[PDB]
A paper describes a structure:
The structure of the complex between full-length ComR from S. thermophilus LMD-9, the octapeptide XIP (ComS17-24 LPYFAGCL) and the pseudopalindromic 20 bp ComR-box from the comX promoter (5’-T10-A9-G8-T7-G6-A5-C4-A3-T2-A1.T1’-A2’-T3’-G4’-T5’-C6’-T7’-C8’-T9’-A10’-3’) has been determined at a resolution of 2.5 Å. The crystals diffracted in space group C2 with a dimer of the ComRS complex bound to one molecule of dsDNA per asymmetric unit. The two XRE-type HTH domains containing 5 α-helices (PROSITE documentation PDOC50943) interact with each other through loop α3-α4 and helix α5 whereas their two 32 Å-apart α3 helices perfectly accommodate in the successive DNA major groove of the two half-sites of the pseudopalindromic dsDNA fragment. H-bonds are made by two arginine residues from α3: R35 and R39. The interacting base pairs GC6, AT5, CG4 and AT3 of the ComR-box were previously shown to be essential for S. thermophilus ComR binding and form a highly conserved GACA motif in ComR-boxes of streptococci. The two TPR domains form a tight dimer characterized by an interface area of 978.5 Å2 and a calculated solvation free energy gain ΔiG of -6.2 kcal mol-1. In particular, salt bridges are formed between two pairs of interacting residues, K87-D200 and K246-E282. Helix α9 is broken and almost perpendicular to α8. Interestingly, the two DNA-binding domains display distinct relative orientations with their respective peptide-binding domain. The N-terminus of the peptide points toward the solvent whereas the C-terminus of the peptide is buried in a deep pocket, characterized by numerous hydrophobic interactions.
Here, we elucidate the structure-function relationship of the transcription factor ComR, a new member of the RNPP family, which positively controls competence for natural DNA transformation in streptococci. ComR is directly activated by the binding of its associated pheromone XIP, the mature form of the comX/sigX-inducing-peptide ComS. XIP-binding induces release of the sequestered HTH domain and ComR dimerization to allow DNA binding. Each TPR domain is composed of 11 α-helices forming 5 TPR motifs followed by an additional C-terminal α-helix α16 called CAP.
Author numbering:
A (entry chain B): 6 to 299
B (entry chain D), D (entry chain C): 17 to 24
C (entry chain A): 3 to 300
Write the structure that this text describes.
DNA sequence: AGTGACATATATGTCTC
DNA sequence: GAGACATATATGTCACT
């Protein structure tokens, strides 16, 4: 099978043995024939070169129990990550329904990291209030404790932080110094090319800005807005820019005491939501504008 | 959390 | 690599408190003298002996080499993201910038990039550096065997769609082309599945834009709205609205040349202009505003 | 190609 | 386009201390 | 553990169609 998996993948990419072997400085076409036919067992050196040429890892090439995650999972994961509910109960119920479909179909083949992402996302979507929903410590003791000690955050680290921001929103009494540590570390994170990572990072930046507004602590507020813009500018995911205009509208109204400039930023978010044809977002921005005395 | 922070 | 595997073998063996003599057992599959050479790095183990070492340690052979070695650095995907995702709209300054970025990408990662990534960069370099069908080589010149295989494939890959894009670049403004071949690959482009590979969907969206632009040049609007709907399906599935202004231009040119409706043509144009302005793309908005003024509107 | 088809 | 013949390289085994 | 020599296998070069 080791020679058959190499031959099958080589022919899948419409690659000849000569192109794979190049100048023969690392592997000759003669020996590639012996490897694919099974006449010789490829050493780790040549198999490492074959893997590099084929774009596959050595693990993918010889793993007997290798299971492959179907495209339907990532299609369902794309709908769970990329379509903002904006806390709409119908969009939340649909995603919670989709999460249950994903679990019953792929649990046996998904690694622990992917199941942890679906688990945290399930608690984030189904969040009701800091009182009723499970506390971050109760379910994510180890993950949140590591986040306290961790300098660089992963996707699941940012998801736990988001669930922590959901519990932190309503409480008047809270750990103020711990919240200041998380802000500086989230602002210190580097923007990847992974859209899932950047989307969750953007969510944390939106939750930080929302928490500063509830606390009326507008220090470093423009820094969060700038990083939220930087995420949008690098991923070109403009479905989230209306939420940035709402942040600037809140900043002009509550901190700069400029109502005319706050209403103009609100109008830019409404126009942005209209051209995106997201009526749920457009209706939410117009309701927030009128509730803000505008 | 407000609606604009619910980007998931 | 010799030390990387021998270090992992010795570490897992010593943490399990198993000795070299106990691991090698009688010696039927591996000897103690060879295990010393494998662990110390003097010799690289073969697959049959690596399978025995994994079996004795309770691991699978994958777990002993589960290292993500020869992984493409993050900087490549970051530089590749800038090449795929920021449309130049045939701007000379943006095209030359990406041509510069390709030269930087190729110098830093050529020895490590897979064949398909190198092929993607090469086709992308020709698409960007394309000027006109008379001064640019035909698709059957620089990609002879590749484009012949694409003529017969049913499921297009990313590089297959990139070759089709260059082939579309050479077809434009040309007369006496293979008509039946053009209609056939149109059907196959409109048959591709839209998954969650943004690189694929962006290139797929490019082919759809090229087909509509060719249909406009040919004055053949059969299945034009079908090409428009699949283009919107790519945008809505991937949520990459950075390309939606181009779709509004297509619907405007459809109303102007097929429906003979200059009112709707000028209205869809305005939707593209306000969409490009809300995206803050100066080159895109100034290009769409020049197209509306050239078609005799506004 | 025209400008709108140059999405690369 | 795959072959087979033959030398070389490398891993592996069997001593040896 | 390490060096010496022998062996099995992988790999490379040649030769042929």
């Amino acid at each position: 099978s080791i020679g058959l998996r190499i031959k099958t993948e080589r022919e899948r990419q419409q690659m000849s043995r000569e192109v794979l072997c190049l100048d023969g400085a690392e592997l000759t076409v003669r020996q590639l024939i012996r490897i694919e036919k099974g006449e010789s067992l490829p050493s780790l050196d040549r198999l490492s070169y074959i893997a590099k040429r084929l774009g596959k890892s050595m693990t993918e090439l010889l793993d007997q129990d290798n299971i492959t995650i179907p495209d339907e999972y990532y299609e369902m994961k794309n709908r769970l990550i990329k379509f903002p509910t904006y806390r709409n109960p119908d969009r939340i119920k649909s995603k919670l329904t989709l999460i249950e479909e994903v679990y019953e179909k792929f649990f046996d083949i998904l690694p622990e990291e992917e199941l942890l992402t679906l688990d945290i996302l399930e608690n984030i979507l189904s969040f009701t209030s800091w009182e009723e929903s499970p506390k971050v410590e109760e379910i994510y003791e180890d993950l949140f404790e590591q986040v306290k000690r961790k300098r660089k955050f992963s996707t699941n680290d940012l998801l736990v932080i988001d669930y922590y921001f959901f519990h932190l929103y309503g409480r008047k009494q809270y750990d103020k110094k711990l919240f200041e540590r998380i802000i500086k570390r989230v602002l210190n994170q580097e923007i990847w090319t992974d859209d899932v990572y950047n989307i969750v990072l953007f969510n944390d930046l939106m939750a930080i800005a929302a928490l500063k507004i509830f606390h009326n602590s507008f220090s470093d507020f423009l820094t969060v807005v700038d990083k939220a813009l930087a995420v949008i500018e690098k991923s070109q995911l403009y479905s989230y820019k209306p939420s940035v205009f709402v942040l600037k509208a809140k900043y002009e109204l509550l901190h700069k005491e400029n109502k005319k400039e706050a209403a103009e930023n609100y109008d830019k978010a409404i126009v942005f939501a209209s051209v995106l044809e997201d009526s749920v977002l457009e209706e939410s921005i117009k309701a927030g504008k009128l509730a803000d005395g505008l | 959390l407000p609606y604009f922070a619910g980007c998931l």
